[PDB]
């Protein structure tokens, strides 16, 4: 009975974990921030309409410039826009048309991409020949690339649908570390501001806190009822949001090691598919399947505004690194830039 | 605008033109999602008609693209919405596994799940009932009644095969939006691809007459 006793020990130890994280939960975050004055109503006007794609755009990532963004659609091409003038600076034809993710390097030299082809292909923008060229094809995943995030021009963490996150080395093209704790397709991914440890949300309805250097699940955050399709760190780095198919966002704290509050509403029943905090982290952006975005007061859980501009469900959503604009991107093949 | 901003806008317009031309060139190829039960006769129909696997073949000035996706072991509900707006869904069912473990009921489950999906509410299904020549003799030894106990018919091929066809064509719940084109995969030169071509031109004609606002 060395299996049954071990499973029973696992259950008792999970009960201990729940008892511990219950013992240090005295005041609900909502109750502490009851006296904070609200942010009123936040009215955002679509400034730009980046209109080039001919299919459902699946991902989008701002450059650290806060001016260049890259959007990847399923027409088989990802475009690099100049957001300030709505100009296209590059149009990169992909080998595989099926794309679920897209990342822009923090330096701005490289752009990663991946989808149902299981390969995270990295493109070299700043070349001597003036044409965007495929640098590497990071193969080794057995699922499908659900998210990619650049650490440096050398390292990249990838989130596949084979229940494993992997840290790559672009030059060698081999996996450095394989993070394997999930029991469901890992749908989203978010780097800490310092890139010392990241967090991944899986179809297991549980987010996990990984360490990039060790490769060990530090903490596991449960609470969601369905697949979690979006993760984003709080700008502090000691909290992250989690969008699920429950149509609820939850803000977990890393130090408290539990959820603080939930961003639910009665007439919201469509599964959220993208989250992002503002620069200060006060208002939490949230991209629903209602074909509109929402703006939650991330300290009070009361809704502040609605970015309703899209004819189809918003896939991608990103706040600029200077917190100047958000860029929603939906299946109507348009991605607006609100402000 | 300045001397460089004008040249940047010119580049933007030129790559936008190339993007539009690539879009209108790639939007004229008919796309077909290739589904089927685990270890069905997918190999036979993918080899006769010529991660994710894409096979591009042409037949009578019509360029087909079949996306054999069944090689992917993950949550099918998490990437199946990528294949909405596909022309047809080629769904091959190994007719010879009516008894093996059952597997026919599992293929029925998959068909019922994908035919009545949110995304494929209007995309016509081209159901292939392959491995006909084995099923021909297999029923004479093993009765079909073990798979369908509510089947009171002759233990012969032409009735049993027609019963399986009727049981599959029953599972669709919207018989007005979407059609189901069934074929019994034959070893004849080009009859399989001919049937695919016929079904695809049919759905294309219906889509075009809908686009004219005339149907």
């Amino acid at each position, epitope marked *: 009975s060395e299996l049954d006793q071990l499973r029973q020990e696992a259950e008792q130890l999970k009960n201990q974990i729940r008892d511990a994280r219950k013992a240090c939960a005295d005041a609900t975050l909502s109750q502490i921030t009851n006296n904070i004055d609200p942010v009123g109503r936040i009215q955002m006007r679509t400034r730009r309409t980046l209109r080039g794609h001919l299919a459902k755009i699946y991902a989008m990532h701002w450059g650290t410039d806060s001016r260049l963004l890259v959007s990847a659609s399923q027409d088989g091409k990802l475009i690099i826009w100049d957001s300030y003038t709505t100009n296209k600076v590059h149009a990169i034809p992909l080998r595989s048309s099926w794309v679920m993710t897209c990342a822009y390097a923090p330096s701005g030299n490289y752009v990663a991409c991946g989808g149902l082809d299981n390969i995270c292909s990295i493109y070299n923008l700043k070349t*001597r*020949e*003036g044409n965007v060229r495929v640098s590497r094809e990071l193969a080794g995943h057995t699922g499908y690339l659900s998210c990619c995030r650049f650490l440096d021009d050398n390292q990249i963490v990838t989130s596949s649908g084979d229940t494993t996150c992997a840290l790559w080395d672009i030059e060698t093209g081999q996996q450095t570390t394989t993070f394997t704790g999930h029991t469901g397709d890992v749908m989203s991914l978010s780097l800490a501001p310092d890139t010392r440890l990241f967090v991944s949300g899986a179809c297991d309805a549980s987010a996990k806190l990984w360490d990039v250097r060790e490769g060990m699940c530090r903490q596991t955050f449960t609470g969601h009822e369905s697949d979690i399709n979006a993760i984003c760190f709080f700008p502090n780095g000691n909290a992250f949001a989690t969008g699920s198919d429950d149509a609820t966002c939850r803000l977990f704290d890393l130090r408290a090691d539990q959820e603080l509050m939930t961003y639910s509403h009665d007439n919201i029943i469509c599964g959220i598919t993208s989250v992002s905090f503002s620069k200060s982290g006060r208002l939490l952006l949230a991209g629903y399947d209602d074909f509109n975005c929402n703006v939650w007061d991330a300290l009070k859980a009361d809704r502040a505004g609605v970015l309703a501009g899209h004819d189809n469900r918003v896939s991608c959503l990103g706040v600029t690194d200077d917190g100047m604009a958000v860029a929603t991107g939906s299946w109507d093949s348009f991605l607006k830039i609100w402000n | 605008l300045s001397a*460089e901003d*004008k040249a940047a806008v*010119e580049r933007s317009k030129m790559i936008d033109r190339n993007l539009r031309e690539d879009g209108e060139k790639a939007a004229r190829e008919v796309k077909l999602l290739l589904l089927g039960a685990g270890e069905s006769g997918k190999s036979t129909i993918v080899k006769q008609m010529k991660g994710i696997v894409e096979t591009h073949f042409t037949f009578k000035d019509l360029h087909f693209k079949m996306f054999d996706v069944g090689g992917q072991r993950s949550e099918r509900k998490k990437w199946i919405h990528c294949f909405e707006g596909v022309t047809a869904i080629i769904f091959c069912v190994a007719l010879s596994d009516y008894d093996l473990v059952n597997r026919m009921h599992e293929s029925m489950k998959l068909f019922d799940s994908i035919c009545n999906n949110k995304w494929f509410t209007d995309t016509s299904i081209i159901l292939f009932l392959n491995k006909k020549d084995l099923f021909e003799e297999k029923i004479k030894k093993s009765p079909l009644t073990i798979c369908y106990p509510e089947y009171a018919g002759s233990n012969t091929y032409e009735e049993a095969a027609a019963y399986i066809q009727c049981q599959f064509e029953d599972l669709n719940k919207r018989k007005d939006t979407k059609e189901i084109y069934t074929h019994f995969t034959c070893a004849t030169d080009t009859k399989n691809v001919q049937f695919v071509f016929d079904a695809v031109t049919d759905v294309i004609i219906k889509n075009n007459l809908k686009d004219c606002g005339l149907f």
Partner: single-chain antibody
Amino acid sequence: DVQLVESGGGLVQPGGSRKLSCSASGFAFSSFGMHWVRQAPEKGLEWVAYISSGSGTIYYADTVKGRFTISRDDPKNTLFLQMTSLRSEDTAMYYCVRSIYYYGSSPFDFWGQGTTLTVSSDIVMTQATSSVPVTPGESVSISCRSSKSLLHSNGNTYLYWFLQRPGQSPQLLIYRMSNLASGVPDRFSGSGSGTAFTLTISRLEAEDVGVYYCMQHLEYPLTFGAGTKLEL
């Protein structure tokens, strides 16, 4: 390995015709807006003509307008300058210069080797100093003032610094008076404001000697400086 090779130079009789061919090999030629700039036998550089990517935009210098015709064959990777009725003021070495224009691009980055052709309102860039001797290891400061303000409304201040070493083709050093060109050491630093600009070189070595040209890119006559020459 990008290379621009000009061919079609030689001695021509005045009022004749000639065609120069710049055969590009080693980059996406179809994506690059290509220029022609000439240099009189002992004078500074001078812009001649420009044809954008897809041939959709052309300009000419007022001196060579009507007489010269620029054209490119993108499939064959060749740039032409069909020049007619050659005057005694066209005896100059002609460079074909690639330039790509998008947000953050470095136009005029690579220059052709140059072909020798011999025959038998706009902005003015003033390089006050025309000669300054210098010893290696020191810090040198080259100045260039414009007439019109090159600081555009969008924030970009379009001024380029080129260096032409003896018996060479000029190479891009700094684009928009701040940004260092790719493969240039961090000794060169661009600074200044509208109608006042300065290229400072810290720890000068025996490779920086030559002529430093000051080009504006605000509007499309492209006017170079007279050129500051470094000696020892």
